[model samples]
Target: FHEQFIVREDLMGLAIGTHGANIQQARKVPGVTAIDLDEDTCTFHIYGEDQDAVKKARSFLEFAEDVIQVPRNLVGKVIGKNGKLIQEIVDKSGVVRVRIEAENEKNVPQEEGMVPFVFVGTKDSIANATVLLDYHLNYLK
Candidate 1:
């Protein structure tokens, strides 16, 4: 089985440490295969031969949420014909949540013509969502 969790993008390097010693420590666990972080989401992905191994590795790599901004002009395209594009991005990218935050909605004023698009999931999925977002954004250009 596989599992993932957030580790903020800023602190991910700390987990890896000098010469990757910190993450290497996690690798010492038997049956643990890989422990990695997704850049987009700052989420760690732990892979192991079994649940126990994953659990053990998880004891090491720990930490996260994420957001992006897209052109306001692209927002309509992202929502697509019937929010279809948005739905497709979430599903195809494997992201757990996708939301378009409004300007001043949270009291954080967005730059003109750019709106915040928040997505949550494994870092890998967040990365995937980013690529999907890019592709979709370009589709209308």
Candidate 2:
């Protein structure tokens, strides 16, 4: 069975190591068929038919998500027509995914007129997306 674990974006380089030596160590674990990364979520996926091996592999790569708060009124602008703008946000920022949390979501305490913006990717991608998103928000004003 395969499983996933989140790793911090900034720490990815260390996890990968020089010439990918770090991750290679985890992949060498018996029964740990393969290990892959999902940059969109900064996650490592451990693949192995054997659950025990997958567990060990996961332990070997033990590691770390972030959210951005966006103005509520500006959500539409960020989303654009049928999500066109948000799509561009990812394309330009090199982020894997971009999501605007629902207005009524209870997970986060509601601010006067703000919402959660989930930008999924490495640290650099998130920073790029944030800068781009901020420009859009400001432009809409």
Candidate 3:
């Protein structure tokens, strides 16, 4: 089972702190598997097979730099032609959700250096992706 929520921007720092505390506290639960975070979108997720632990993990997602801007020029590099790169990221990160923000008028005007690339899921998964993106974004530079 899983659950998540959005953290408030103004209190992001505090939320991170709270997350740390929650992570520590949740560790006490045997059934709780893992707690994940996406600093970019200020999202938090808890993955556990137990119902009670699932309820315990519920409190963290309350808000996150976790949002990574993809740089308009490099969107395709990360997103690929047909969600090719995107799926790889999802697989590698083990993140439940990942999104490549596209260029559209409805969003902030597409700027040269700005692209919306969001990472959402577990710390380990995000950590895995971070390692990959270090290479992926490194290639971008």
TM-score of each: 0.55, 0.52, 0.47
lDDT of 2 at 54: 88
Compared with the true structure, all predictions reach lDDT values of 0.76, 0.77, 0.64
Q: For residue 77, what is the lDDT in candidate 3? A: 66
User: Which of 1 and 3 is the better model by TM-score?
Assistant: 1
Worst 10 residues of 2 by lDDT: 57-66
- lDDT string for model 3 (71-132, tens) is 56555666667877778887877665666666666766665578666776545556677677
- Taking every candidate in turn, the Cα RMSD to the unseen true structure, in Å, is 10.2, 11.5, 10.4
What is the C-alpha lDDT profile of model 1 across 66-109, one tens digit per residue? 78889987778778898888998889977668778785556656
9: Cα error in model 2, Å? 11
Candidate 3 is scored at a TM of 0.47
- Give me the overall lDDT of model 3: 0.64
What is the full ranking by TM-score, best candidate first?
Answer: 1, 2, 3
- Between the candidate structures 1 and 2, which one is better when assessed by lDDT? 2
